[PDB]
Amino acid sequence: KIRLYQFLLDLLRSGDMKDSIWWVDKDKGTFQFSSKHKEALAHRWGIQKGNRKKMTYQKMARALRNYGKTGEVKKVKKKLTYQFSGEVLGR
DNA sequence: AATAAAGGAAGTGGG
DNA sequence: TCCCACTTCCATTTA
Ligand code: NA
């Protein structure tokens, strides 16, 4: 099953939910969620995973925070903004 | 107040 | 057995 960081990177590459997520500086791997349209993207993540409950942005962001230690995704000090590691971007 | 963004603990999956 | 990679739940802080 796909990992959350890969699901997000793939969306950014495909542009399929451009109103929910976008690159801020793709060279740096920084990206930002839409305040008003992030829930639709969270719903898609839960459906793709086949989870029992409806996924919310809050639960998705709870998972994202767990990457901060290992480094795949880090929170940036800007609203709704995160950053992929160089290793994730390269792979 | 109303709204919104921003981790400890225990449960679930598939090894 | 016991970690993976989250998921779910609940609570708190700041703006
Ligand atoms: Na929020």
Residue A9 CA and nucleotide B1 C1' are separated, in Å, by: 39
CA dist A48 → A1, A2, A19, A43, A71 (Å): 9, 9, 19, 9, 24
CA distance A75 to A1: 24
DSSP A10-27: HHHHHTTTTTTEEEEETT
Helices in chain A by DSSP H: which ranges? 4-14, 38-49, 57-65, 67-70, 86-90
The experimental resolution of this structure, in angstroms, equals 1.4
Report the binding-site residues of A for DNA: 49, 62, 65, 75
Experimental method: X-ray
**Nearest nt (C1') from A32 Cα:** B5
- What is chain A's Cα-based Rg? 12
Residue A42 CA and nucleotide C3 C1' are separated, in Å, by: 26
Structural tokens at position A79: 């609203």
CA dist A79 → A14, A32, A63, A76 (Å): 23, 8, 17, 8
Which is nearest to A25 in space by CA: A84, A90, A87, A70? A84
